[PDB]
Amino acid sequence: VHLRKSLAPYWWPIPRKAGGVWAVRPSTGPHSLEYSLPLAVVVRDVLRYAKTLREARYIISRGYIKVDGVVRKDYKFPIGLMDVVEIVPTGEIYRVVPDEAKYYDLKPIPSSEAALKPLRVEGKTAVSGGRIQLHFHDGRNLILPPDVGRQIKTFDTVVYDLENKAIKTHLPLRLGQLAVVTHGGNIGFVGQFFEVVWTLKRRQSVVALRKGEEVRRTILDYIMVIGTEAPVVKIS
Amino acid sequence: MKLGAFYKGGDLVKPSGGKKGRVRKTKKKALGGGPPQIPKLGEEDIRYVERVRGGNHKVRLRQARYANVYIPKERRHVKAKILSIVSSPSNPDYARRNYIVKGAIIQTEVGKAVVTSRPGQDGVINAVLI
Amino acid sequence: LEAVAAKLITRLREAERLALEGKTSEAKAILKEVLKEARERGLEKSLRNLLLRVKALLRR
């Protein structure tokens, strides 16, 4: 599979004319192709540690880069929203957080925060033994007993412990919580969920966030609750 | 299978009755079909597992002797023997040539039964007593 | 040479039969003596197939 540079996603931090005709294609991993950046692109164009694809692939193949608590030795590994990126020989820890200008940026985060990931619940399924499988925004799954799975609804958020494989906390989608827009145009805006128009399709409901007097609107699919008035994890 | 001899692709005829040109010269393998594989009434059950699209498998009953006949008036399942086919309402040629299809009436040892399964697609004859 | 070579093949097949029976010590003895004979008389590569078969049999 190839990725022509013209068909590369528009938000990617690469030049559109100066360069080759190809771009590094993400390797079908734990995100969306159009909402993720390959690890080699992160190493070469986002952190500037490697000057070529060869040097970036060397750095990745040594195992110096860790994504969400797991060493990633594939240079095409997708990196997406809220992922924790950890550099081993340097000790620097970033979170892939929504950004107003670059649309997705690596912001440094504390080491205590590096083991948590805020994952937006994307759906629920019934699996064998009567258990509930929660599907999150990046394709991750969690199988839980039916009673705990009953009270978690779609579009909720869970702060999830990567190291324990557990749900550290659950943040339900209620009016007045703090939410961040993770998608289109109004990206990166943090504000209070204060207004909803419930369309017939729940994913397409109109949501309005407020930051003092700053009112932005999106659809319900494009927001993620990151807690009450103070965000649980450092996003900015 | 996926055979060009049993192509399931579009027609060349418009709804207005006129013809239209061929957008694609060759026949897609994805749009190919296969010949009928419904069982023939025989002396022993012969089953054949076939590879299909995407590497999945389909069990074909190339010859059928026994039927899983369900009596709802007893709430019981019995593995009966097919003496003959009484009728094939979809096409009488099936019963005439002793082929078993869905909706076919079969005279098994428990009585008359309607075939409630697709024997060419499921590989078994699930039947319901009448 | 043909008499020596044929006799060596006989001892090789008897060794493989004993190894198939399970008599690994007897088969090892026959293999060692036939190996010494082949090393002195230059029939190693000629008997290469049967030597490989008997070695695999005694490994098994």
Add this chain to the structure above:
Amino acid sequence: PTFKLVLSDPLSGKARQFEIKDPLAQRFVGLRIGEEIDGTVLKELIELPKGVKIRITGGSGVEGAPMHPGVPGPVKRYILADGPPGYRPRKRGMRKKKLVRGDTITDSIVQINAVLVYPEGYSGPPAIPLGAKELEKLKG
């Protein structure tokens, strides 16, 4: 017909080739693959024990077309080969039309491959302890 018969000893792993001719030519003609002929016929060419029966394993024709055991009759045929006997596919699932010949020996055959049959319970010496070229290279 003149033949270049290969005879294979299944106990020594070796084979020997004899040019077969006038009296044995009609003996080899007419034989299907796998047929049984006693080893005493080759008395003038090879010294066999009186328990060995030579089986017809195969052959190759005047243009090199091998004898296909699955085809009957003494005929030349084109087959859409997908398997080993008469075709060695370089790609998985690749089928080819390959010229072959029938299981019956004809006069157009140039090579006949046959293998010894030692008697049941035999434990003697191999009929061919060494090949001719092997012995010649050993001696030099």
Add this chain to the structure above:
RNA sequence: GCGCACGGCUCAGUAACACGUGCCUAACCUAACCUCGGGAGGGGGACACCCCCGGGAAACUGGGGUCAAUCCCCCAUAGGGGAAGGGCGCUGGAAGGCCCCUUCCCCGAAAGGGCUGGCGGCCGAUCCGCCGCCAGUCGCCCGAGGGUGGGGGCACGGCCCAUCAGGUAGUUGGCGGGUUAAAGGCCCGCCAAGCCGAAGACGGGUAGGGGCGGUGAGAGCCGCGAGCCCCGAGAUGGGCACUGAGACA
């Protein structure tokens, strides 16, 4: 084993769900990768290279011998499918779906394999291995979701001619089936006469569609709508298949 179905070319066919925009699949498949849960037990076989012989002009190819596997197969279990009945429960706008219970029939997994280090034992220089355990690591199988690719459907939009006015008969629809990964006159059996058309059918002509390009103050006109990117089709003409997740390459 994996890849070669991407990449490269070109513009015959095509006035079409081809293409563009906006939506679907609750009617579907998907190797590689991600995540969550679970599993990896017993047994067997063959074919290369190779050795001994070849045959044939070449292409190619025969017989015997012999060592292996993450090669091929059987067994067990897990799991899966079909028919029928029931249900708190799940998703979702909506269950023909998921999960649970019940019955029968049917199909039916796996490579603990490689490496590293440690331990122990068997074995022998004719050996430089084999076996049992542990940790690390790359792997293998099942279930669910994602990802990616693909198949299919829908509404609308973009040529000329009436010196082309009636066209259509599997044609239009229904019912029951077969096939398919999956809906569908896709195909088949029966039933009805329906369907399109002057808001231009049908017929002919021209043409790959789009982003876009030239020109003009602009409306607009033109396609130099060749080169660059996206989709389509094709590989001398016409057909049909193997393998495979995927080709009719």
